[PDB]
Amino acid sequence: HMATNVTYQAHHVSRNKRGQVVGTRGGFRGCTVWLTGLSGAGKTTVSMALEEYLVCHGIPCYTLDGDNIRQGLNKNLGFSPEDREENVRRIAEVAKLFADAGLVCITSFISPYTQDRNNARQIHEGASLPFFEVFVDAPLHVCEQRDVKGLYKKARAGEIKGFTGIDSEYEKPEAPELVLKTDSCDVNDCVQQVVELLQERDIVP
Amino acid sequence: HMATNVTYQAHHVSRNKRGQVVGTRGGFRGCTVWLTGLSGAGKTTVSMALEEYLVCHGIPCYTLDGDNIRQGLNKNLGFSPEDREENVRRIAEVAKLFADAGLVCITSFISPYTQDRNNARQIHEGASLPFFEVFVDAPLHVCEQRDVKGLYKKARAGEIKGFTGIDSEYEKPEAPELVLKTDSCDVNDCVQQVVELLQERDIVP
Ligand SMILES: Nc1ncnc2c1ncn2[C@@H]1O[C@H](COP(=O)(O)OS(=O)(=O)O)[C@@H](OP(=O)(O)O)[C@H]1O
Ligand SMILES: Nc1ncnc2c1ncn2[C@@H]1O[C@H](COP(=O)(O)OS(=O)(=O)O)[C@@H](OP(=O)(O)O)[C@H]1O
Ligand SMILES: Nc1ncnc2c1ncn2[C@@H]1O[C@H](COP(=O)(O)OP(=O)(O)O)[C@@H](O)[C@H]1O
Ligand SMILES: Nc1ncnc2c1ncn2[C@@H]1O[C@H](COP(=O)(O)OP(=O)(O)O)[C@@H](O)[C@H]1O
Ligand SMILES: [Mg+2]
Ligand SMILES: [Mg+2]
């Protein structure tokens, strides 16, 4: 349960050369926009709108969404703390791949644990890939009100164990690059705030 | 250890839209080029050359290499059959994501087990994403004689247990899309054959 006798194999294409090949707009802009927040905060809504916005603006990107990823790559993971650690760890590594390829990678995972969000950042920092932690911030009471997928109601009645914000911790970002107050903003205002961040950080022209 | 109460989250961007954004060469051509073969057969040499080639010809792509992924995403897997199953499963899912994103994903994993290669294919087929299995085929005695990484010498000494071809199985591809006889072709010739396949399949114009 640990890779041994493995040797790093260097690619034969530079990041600059990938910058040239990816998209129609010149420059390398691989990075990760790491959304984090409560269930129902608006993570998927923002991430899917952002992906649409970026593609519409000639920037190849890809959304890795916790729910979707948990139907493939991370289908063998549950919601114990251990398993959420592994879930985020695997996607942080995938996200780093997407970013290294030159895509703007957008992850919409709960990612409830500081240490694991930091671990994701550091994977990216070590690769010289910009990493933007975005706190999709709606009050839990708002999130439960929305109860989009009926999960909070199930969690309430004890029918789902370990539900984030009900029976599992959410560790509020303390140092995110951007906070999105999705209870007081609309989706397009939230997208706009992320775009403004990406323009400031030379990812969106 | 199973994802529960997860729901598919639809993207707001189509494959068509992605193909307009991804290259400077229009049309969607997301797919996976899945290499397989003995250690030392030439998988990384071909995969890195192919990646360089495709980037140099304006085709976004990314190489997922077994040694590399086993230092990040799959660092927590060894080389037991079950771990190689899980190794390959994870990367097939990741490959699917790259291909879905509109990149040519090139994997270079020993991927010694027919059934796991088949599953990788089926994951792609399930997503209407082309999948090309490329058997990087040098005879074991040739791979041993190259022994760049000194692994065969170690395996043979029993310094490395469960080494493919020595103390672990390699199930030869019986229906790959392409065979690369790397004992009798140079890398650029092996690249040209994969490019030729990709042209037949309308992945490279
Ligand atoms: N117990 C429990 N807790 C939290 N969430 C649960 C749980 N069970 C299922 N779900 C569904 O899975 C989605 C969360 O998956 P993530 O991969 O984002 O979670 S995590 O990052 O590993 O914490 C989450 O999606 P969002 O609503 O988008 O957050 C739910 O649809
Ligand atoms: N026991 C054993 N067997 C085979 N290979 C081993 C082993 N131990 C370490 N290595 C190193 O790991 C590389 C193979 O990893 P892969 O992920 O490609 O293997 S697999 O698909 O899970 O079979 C392999 O790389 P290649 O030489 O490119 O095949 C080796 O560098
Ligand atoms: N500014 C906003 N950004 C994102 N979502 C919002 C916003 N305002 C309201 N919402 C709503 O909040 C709900 C959150 O759903 P979702 O995107 O599934 O959240 P998560 O992925 O965090 O579970 C959606 O019904 C969405 O329409
Ligand atoms: N088609 C080829 N012809 C001649 N030598 C090759 C070919 N492909 C690879 N090699 C050489 O064989 C060795 C092993 O190749 P590598 O790409 O690391 O194999 P794998 O990834 O399958 O273990 C390297 O020294 C490499 O230069
Ligand atoms: Mg969501
Ligand atoms: Mg190799």
Swiss-Prot record, chains A, B:
Subunit structure, interactors included? Homodimer.
Task: Write out the residues that bind ATP 1.
Answer: G40, A41, G42, K43, T44, T45, C185, C190
Residue segments, region Adenylyl-sulfate kinase: 4-203
Which ranges form a coiled coil?
A: none
Domain characteristics, as noted in the entry: The N-terminal first 50 residues are required for inhibition by the substrate adenylyl sulfate.
Residue positions binding adenosine 5'-phosphosulfate = D67, N68, I69, R70, F79, R84, E85, E86, N87, I110, S111, K149, G162, F163
Protein's recorded name: Bifunctional 3'-phosphoadenosine 5'-phosphosulfate synthase 1
Please explain the role this protein plays, according to its UniProt record: Bifunctional enzyme with both ATP sulfurylase and APS kinase activity, which mediates two steps in the sulfate activation pathway. The first step is the transfer of a sulfate group to ATP to yield adenosine 5'-phosphosulfate (APS), and the second step is the transfer of a phosphate group from ATP to APS yielding 3'-phosphoadenylylsulfate (PAPS: activated sulfate donor used by sulfotransferase). In mammals, PAPS is the sole source of sulfate; APS appears to be only an intermediate in the sulfate-activation pathway.
Hey, which family's this protein in? Answer: In the N-terminal section; belongs to the APS kinase family. In the C-terminal section; belongs to the sulfate adenylyltransferase family.
Which superkingdom heads the taxonomic lineage of this protein's source?
Answer: Eukaryota
Outcome recorded upon mutating R18A? Abolishes inhibition by the substrate adenylyl sulfate
Reported tissue expression: Expressed in testis, pancreas, kidney, thymus, prostate, ovary, small intestine, colon, leukocytes and liver. Also expressed in high endothelial venules (HEV) cells and in cartilage.
